[PDB]
């Protein structure tokens, strides 16, 4: 239908916490083929993060149970099969968004901000596929994640100020990629630490619009360093 309608209904879906309705609405908007506005790209992002987020969370709960029922045959096999069912939904959700990104979002970006946003998103959804990828931990979807993040990383570093929330957010997520998917804590800490130290040197550049987002992400970077440096 019309795009101001679909968006209206996405926002209503969002208020009702009906994230599949919100997702379907924004998928339809993006399939119309026009560059999303900022508001539209933020709604699309929230909707899918919530849909995939429910599956990632269920998957972690069921994986933990599977681990803890080692030696308890009937329980562990049921946990196994349930985890596999959840994985298939998660992979379908990710493939959905990665197809949206490849067909519409990336090809129409046109501003560096938006290009960095969507490559980050492609790295993120491949990172979610990597979390469950066949080999029970990682697999060749790891390179797609890394390469989308690297290209985002180079653009953001050339086109954006260090306190920009999209640049800070990508550094945060790319460092989580190094730490969790590539099992490389030193590189993860170095990337997070550089992003934090470079933004903090330019507190000046914080804007009235982005103050809150930037500041939150800067704290997330510092908390990851605290977590990943746990020793003393």
């Amino acid at each position: 239908m019309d795009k101001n309608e679909l968006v209206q209904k996405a926002k209503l879906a969002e208020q009702a916490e009906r994230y599949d309705d919100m997702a379907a609405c924004m998928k339809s908007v993006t399939e119309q083929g026009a560059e999303l506005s900022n508001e539209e790209r933020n709604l699309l992002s929230v909707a899918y993060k919530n849909v995939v987020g429910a599956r990632r969370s269920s998957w972690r709960v069921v994986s933990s149970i599977e681990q803890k029922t080692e030696g308890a045959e009937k329980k562990q096999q049921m946990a196994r099969e349930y985890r596999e069912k959840i994985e298939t939904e998660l992979r379908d959700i990710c493939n959905d968004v990665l197809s949206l990104l490849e067909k519409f979002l990336i090809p129409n970006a046109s501003q560096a901000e938006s290009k960095v946003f969507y490559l980050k998103m492609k790295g993120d959804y491949y990172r979610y596929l990597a979390e469950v990828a066949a080999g029970d931990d990682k697999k060749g979807i790891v390179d797609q994640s890394q390469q989308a993040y690297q290209e985002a990383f180079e653009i953001s570093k050339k086109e954006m100020q260090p306190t920009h929330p999209i640049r800070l957010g990508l550094a945060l997520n790319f460092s989580v990629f190094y730490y969790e998917i590539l099992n490389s804590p030193e590189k993860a800490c170095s990337l997070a630490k550089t992003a934090f130290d470079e933004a903090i040197a330019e507190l000046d550049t914080l804007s009235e619009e982005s103050y809150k987002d930037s500041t939150l992400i800067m704290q997330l970077l510092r908390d990851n360093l605290t977590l990943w440096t746990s020793d003393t």
Binding site: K49, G169, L172, V176, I217, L220, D223, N224, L227, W228
Partner: peptide
């Protein structure tokens, strides 16, 4: 668990 953004 490592924090990422949006959460």
């Amino acid at each position: 668990r490592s924090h990422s953004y949006p959460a």
